[PDB]
Design a protein around this nucleic acid. Structure first.
Ligand SMILES: [Mg+2]
Ligand SMILES: [Mg+2]
Ligand SMILES: [Mg+2]
Ligand SMILES: [Mg+2]
Ligand SMILES: [Mg+2]
Ligand SMILES: [Mg+2]
Ligand SMILES: [Mg+2]
Ligand SMILES: [Mg+2]
Ligand SMILES: [Mg+2]
Ligand SMILES: [Mg+2]
Ligand SMILES: [Mg+2]
Ligand SMILES: [Mg+2]
Ligand SMILES: [Mg+2]
Ligand SMILES: [Mg+2]
Ligand SMILES: [Mg+2]
Ligand SMILES: [Mg+2]
Ligand SMILES: [Mg+2]
Ligand SMILES: [Mg+2]
Ligand SMILES: [Mg+2]
Ligand SMILES: [Mg+2]
Ligand SMILES: [Mg+2]
Ligand SMILES: [Mg+2]
Ligand SMILES: [Mg+2]
Ligand SMILES: [Mg+2]
Ligand SMILES: [Mg+2]
Ligand SMILES: [Mg+2]
Ligand SMILES: [Mg+2]
Ligand SMILES: [Mg+2]
Ligand SMILES: [Mg+2]
Ligand SMILES: [Mg+2]
Ligand SMILES: [Mg+2]
Lengths: 115, 236, 157
RNA sequence: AAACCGGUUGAUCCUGCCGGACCCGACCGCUAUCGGGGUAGGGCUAAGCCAUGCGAGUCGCGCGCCCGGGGGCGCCCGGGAGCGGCGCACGGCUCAGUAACACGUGCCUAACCUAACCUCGGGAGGGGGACACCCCCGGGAAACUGGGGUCAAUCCCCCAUAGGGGAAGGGCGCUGGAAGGCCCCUUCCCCGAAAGGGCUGGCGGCCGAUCCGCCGCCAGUCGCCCGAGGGUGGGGGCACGGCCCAUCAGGUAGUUGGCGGGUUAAAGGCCCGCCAAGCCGAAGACGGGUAGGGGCGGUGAGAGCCGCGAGCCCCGAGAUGGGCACUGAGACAAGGGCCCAGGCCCUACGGGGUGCAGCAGGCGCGAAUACUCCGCAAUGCGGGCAACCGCGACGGGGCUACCCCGAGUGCCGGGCGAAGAGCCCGGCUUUUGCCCGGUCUAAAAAGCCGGGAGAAUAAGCGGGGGGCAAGUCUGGUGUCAGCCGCCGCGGUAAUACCAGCUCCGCGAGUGGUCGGGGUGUUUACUGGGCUUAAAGCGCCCGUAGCCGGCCCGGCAAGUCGCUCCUGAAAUCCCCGGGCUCAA
């Protein structure tokens, strides 16, 4: 159904994060939710879900296997300053949506000014 | 200024087709444009610490990377032959040494060795006060008194202390010393300087290095003496 | 001033005089035997065969010293693909290869020859609809050239 | 696959031309379900004309002011109009000019400049000024713009020193292949730096809530000035290489050279004063024609031929035609300036603006053509300490028979049918199409995973006399209508026209016309021919060119072998790997 495993885990001390690559095996089943991948990784690593960010879940052709690229951060402030706004919007839920909306408002401003 | 990816140097460790149409252009610093790699390219494609130019520029702007004893916060800083690269939060120290396969590679070196740089003398000039300015292979200069400047010739090597701004040792270009090819085709070969044909132009003289029975030839401009039978600094 | 664009890969297999009755008969026989969609598939197989044969001719024309670092890997690759059965045959025997050897390596042909389908067209339908698994993954291209190591890893759903 | 076939004869062997068959590019007709990969699309047509929108900003850690919230120490946060720095000379377009040091390869500048960045050595002292925004008034249709007041600077200027240049003389010394160069000494003349500015923390002092600063020191940090080298960009020079025509044979007069100067960052008839007659040309001047050059592309078994030498990358030139300048390190500057020409738009008649060869878009021309769409998430660049900001570059989709790749338009058994098509019967499957979820995406779309019903939603184009695969089957017409790349049919019994039936070739393609290659040993180096088929000048002398006896000795230029520096990347061939294989 959904067999998850830590395929690999690199540690980038420069960005203060760990980049985990996870293997997901789901035969005859849909692609796993990125929320489910984050919950499994949080439970596996003993960390809060907010500290874990998914970059991309790519599913093979012709088989229910998916590889997920996940970032785990030592603190939420550096996580939100490093990860892209669309990534935070995908992962954090509503706070990423709020960040994207505020960015869009601040871009509409100064464009009206440039007009 | 822009650098089209087609006009990027061929030895650079980047794909030639898959990617954008631009490449990070080195910012006119202490090397040659075609014999150096920008710091962002080193961070993103050589060490794989950053996944994008934004992340690489963040890492560089924090001051985590040190080149030749000085923190470099410019993402376009050129990195070239024999440069010491130091990562601060991790403690890892590399030397940019000539390589047979990648043509230029970051090889880890000891912390005691990290403060020394073997610089090939590229020329001498007479400057004010009667002093001698030595110009090295990466554009660095050193002003010395005339008596010490008299006995150092072009194509010699000096092991130079970055922290003291002094010449730790001088390795003159003599037959039988150990030399490394720092340029074209026969790059990275280490061997004994055992044969020379002195052309009229000294820079274009034909030099032959030997590694047991392995004989390679280059021009005199393309070799650097790294000492006698044992190299002074870890290059391999 | 010229910009490179891709060219058809089956041109080397396609004949220049299509209106020969003998050539039409043999091509029709091959097409009906292996259940090919159109003449383009047969000509692609012939182009593959022509590449193999001309590689053999070129390696024969090179000297012994030049041929030495290429002769053994070439036959090894042909054996691994399944076009040649003995990887240690002489090089000039490779010159006499036949397009039926290449046509046997099609996934539809292998599905029919393993008895997984009632007919070659039913094997093509199986591969198209996705009921053929190659080592666990669905391979939906009937024209896929299965290698020797992957030949035994063919299953049905 | 290193290929032939049809045609001139009553028949035969030749010559030799034309056609057929293949690939590629452009346009066009009929038809067209899906997906993937890719740097396809007003080039081949007027560098023809344009409505509209967008297309270079960034910096408060350079500077003063104003506004709003907060708080007491010395300000914190946010915003505004600006001055000021840096950038806008990169990036984007297109192909008129150009047969040229434009371009390519190989070398130079010892004849030169270069902001930003790197390194080494040294320096940062004294003093002064103005102009914005703003306030009080405006003027003008608009564009734009006037007067007074007033606060600043990394804004502007002077002074000092450092330093720099010119002339001349001398020298151990440096570089370098070689000094007209560098350094040292000597003399005079001349020019002539700097922002210790910002921030952080600490210390001390002056000062006041009408202040929230100013000053002196220290450390850190980003900065400023001089000298030298590098880096980058640029200017300039050299050798060689790549079109047609003689129904173009003489051309040139600052033209060729020398000498002395001016200008330039720098050499040069670059320009100027004098002096000489030189310079180019049949090894093709000059003249005309065509054309941006290269990487490269199509075709052929190859030599070769062609340019589809449009798209992609590098160099060049241009911004309606022709000129000339400002600023600046850099322009004589596509979305900056000035003038002539030639258009056009607004106006309040006094004035102002404007030329899409930028991304969309409109008209025109033509055989011939895309959305007035989305994002700065990737690739980079300018600015910034940074965070970040901007970018019609770039990225993404749209449209379009752009090129390549993979598939569908069912499978199985039975019957009728002919063994065919098709129909019916029984079973199977769901690629595909349709609906839903996850994933994916900057967000979408698509893709992938999974779920639902269902045979169900999906084949055309050309042809059947020979070449050349496919009908002497049927009807109609009757040298008419029509076919016909060539040979040839049709004038009553048409296998060739018009239709039916049927078969053939390729197939999401299949045809028409063009251009290139093959064809073609019809351009012949490989490799043709000249008695009669086209082709020996009516004959001879001879210049350039090409071709040239034997032996010995020297060289090593051609030649051959090895090696090095190179011939950007992409493209091409081989090998390994990763996309489901494939591309
Ligand atoms: Mg006859
Ligand atoms: Mg045009
Ligand atoms: Mg600052
Ligand atoms: Mg402001
Ligand atoms: Mg440009
Ligand atoms: Mg200044
Ligand atoms: Mg001087
Ligand atoms: Mg002064
Ligand atoms: Mg001042
Ligand atoms: Mg002069
Ligand atoms: Mg002249
Ligand atoms: Mg041929
Ligand atoms: Mg274009
Ligand atoms: Mg003009
Ligand atoms: Mg202009
Ligand atoms: Mg125009
Ligand atoms: Mg346009
Ligand atoms: Mg971006
Ligand atoms: Mg296809
Ligand atoms: Mg029957
Ligand atoms: Mg979707
Ligand atoms: Mg038809
Ligand atoms: Mg008929
Ligand atoms: Mg026939
Ligand atoms: Mg006919
Ligand atoms: Mg002939
Ligand atoms: Mg005759
Ligand atoms: Mg005669
Ligand atoms: Mg005559
Ligand atoms: Mg006569
Ligand atoms: Mg020779």
């Amino acid at each position: 159904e959904a067999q998850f495993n830590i395929l690999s885990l690199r540690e980038n001390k420069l960005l203060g994060r760990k980049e985990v690559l996870v293997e997901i095996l789901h035969r005859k089943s849909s692609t796993p939710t990125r929320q489910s991948v984050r919950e499994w990784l949080a439970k596996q690593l003993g960390v809060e879900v907010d500290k874990i960010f998914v970059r991309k879940i790519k599913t093979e052709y012709g088989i229910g296997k998916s590889k997920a690229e996940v970032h785990v951060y030592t603190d939420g402030a550096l996580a939100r300053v490093i990860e892209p706004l669309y990534i935070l919007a995908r992962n954090l839920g509503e706070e990423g949506k709020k960040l994207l909306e505020e960015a869009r408002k601040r871009r509409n401003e100064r464009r009206e000014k440039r007009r | 200024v822009h650098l089209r990816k087609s006009l990027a140097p061929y030895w650079w460790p980047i794909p030639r087709k898959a990617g954008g149409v631009w490449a990070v252009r080195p910012s006119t610093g202490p090397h040659s444009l075609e014999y150096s790699l920008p710091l962002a390219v080193v961070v993103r494609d050589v060490l794989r610490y950053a996944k994008t130019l934004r992340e690489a520029r963040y890492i560089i702007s924090r001051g985590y990377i040190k080149v030749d004893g000085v923190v470099r916060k410019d993402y376009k800083f050129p990195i070239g032959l024999m440069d010491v690269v130091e990562i601060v939060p991790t403690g890892e120290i590399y030397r940019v040494v000539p390589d047979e396969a990648k043509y230029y590679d970051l090889k880890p070196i000891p912390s005691s060795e990290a403060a020394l740089k073997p610089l090939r003398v590229e020329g001498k000039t007479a400057v004010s006060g009667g002093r001698i300015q030595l110009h090295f292979h990466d554009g660095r200069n050193l002003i010395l008194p005339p008596d010490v400047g008299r006995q150092i010739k072009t194509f010699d090597t000096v092991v130079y202390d970055l922290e003291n701004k002094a010449i730790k040792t001088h390795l003159p270009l003599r037959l039988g010393q150990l030399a490394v090819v720092t340029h074209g085709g026969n790059i990275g070969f280490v061997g004994q300087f055992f044969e020379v044909v002195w052309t009229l132009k000294r820079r274009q003289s034909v030099v032959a290095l030997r590694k047991g029975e392995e004989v390679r030839r280059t021009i005199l401009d393309y070799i650097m003496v790294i000492g006698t039978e044992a190299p002074v600094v870890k290059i391999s | 001033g010229g910009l490179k664009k891709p060219k058809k890969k089956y041109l080397a297999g396609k004949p220049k005089k299509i209106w020969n009755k003998q050539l039409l008969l043999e091509e029709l026989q091959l097409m009906g035997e292996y259940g090919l969609r159109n003449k383009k598939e047969l000509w692609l197989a012939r182009a593959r065969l022509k590449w193999i044969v001309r590689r053999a001719r070129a390696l024969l024309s090179m000297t012994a010293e030049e041929r030495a670092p290429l002769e053994v890997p070439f036959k090894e690759k042909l054996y691994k693909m399944g076009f040649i059965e003995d990887p240690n045959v002489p090089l000039d025997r490779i010159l006499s290869l036949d397009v039926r050897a290449i046509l046997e390596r099609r996934l539809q042909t292998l599905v029919f020859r393993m008895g997984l389908a009632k007919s070659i067209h039913h094997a093509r339908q199986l591969v198209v609809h996705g009921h053929v698994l190659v080592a666990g993954r669905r391979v939906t291209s009937p024209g896929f050239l299965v290698p020797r190591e992957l030949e035994d890893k063919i299953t049905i759903e």
